[PDB]
Amino acid sequence: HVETFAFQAEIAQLMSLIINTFYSNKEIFLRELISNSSDALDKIRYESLTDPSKLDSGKELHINLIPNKQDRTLTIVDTGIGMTKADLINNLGTIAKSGTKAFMEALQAGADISMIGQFGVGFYSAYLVAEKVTVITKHNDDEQYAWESSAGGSFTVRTDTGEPMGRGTKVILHLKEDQTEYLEERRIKEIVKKHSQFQGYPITLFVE
Amino acid sequence: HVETFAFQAEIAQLMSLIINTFYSNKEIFLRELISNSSDALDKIRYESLTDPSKLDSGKELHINLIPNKQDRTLTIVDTGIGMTKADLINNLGTIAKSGTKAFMEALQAGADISMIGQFGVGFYSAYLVAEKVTVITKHNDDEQYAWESSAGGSFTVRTDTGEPMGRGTKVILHLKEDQTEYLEERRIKEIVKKHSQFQGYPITLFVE
Ligand SMILES: CCn1cnc2c(N)ncnc21
């Protein structure tokens, strides 16, 4: 079945600022989520150094970028450590609150939105370009789940019925109608080469 | 007793470049290590969300900066997750190698040293200002250890005899003789306010 939850009020308010506030360097959402995938991979790798059996769910450590003009979605796939039910419901929220509140301070007090990842809340930069975000995720210790929000204050969590992925995370961006440039091959290569490309696992772009 | 180990050749070569290569924005070492402390704290906090008993070794989550003109040392203390014997010997090394090799690519191919933390190897920026670095560390699952290097290719690891700290990490910088400006109160406040001060735990400076 499906459970509906409210965002914490500060995450709710950050999400409203991102959605509305007119801002035209929206391409940063992609380095932020590639960066989140990098971290996830570092974590399952690190864990696998004292327990090779954590990799039983997959040896491959990579990030895939999969545009789809027909569904109008850009998907970021990584084979990182994934996320548990408590992560999606309570735990990531709690860790996010301070980063959030602080970021909202830096926003109304000078600084620009490109600095979201410096406060550990880059994930929400998805809402620059996406109307709905769907996250399919699987951690060694837990079931596969789907998390979904279109913002406006709430989110859903159901255990995921569909195709098993073994371990990792798949962020599905349902792109706003004026944001389709991010489904184009060379738009994508340009950003990926531009920003993120220090770290550090293979980033493969799937051509349609 | 004391065990002596060789650095991996790429860490050895990064450490030589940092030590020698004349470079005059050396104040970045401090945001890099404050940033490492921030991460450590995020990790023990995150872990404590599904197991409050991880905090049995200390509820306080903070970073202390302790200059000492007499011993000529600047110490960074955090009550983060700390580091185990395998972390100091094998595990952090392994995770560092790619970041390292890549950073050395960016160094001889344009980019400047301020970008060390972007490759997850900021810790080594200590050697801009320190001749010897001593690290006292304690993880819930392991004994207290001391790690020490003056570079030139090797490092030591002994189980730490002295004053128990409960949990966390204490980075002791034995400052080079021309680097004593980093023992001054307002030098320290200036850098700490300048760079790092988005995230996100209390940073307390101890006055002598
Ligand atoms: C910070 C939480 N978080 C955000 N993105 C991810 C991810 N792709 N994999 C695992 N955890 C994540």
Ligand SMILES: CCn1cnc2c(N)ncnc21
């Ligand atoms: C990346 C490894 N690492 C570097 N610094 C620390 C630290 N203070 N506490 C825990 N781990 C650390």
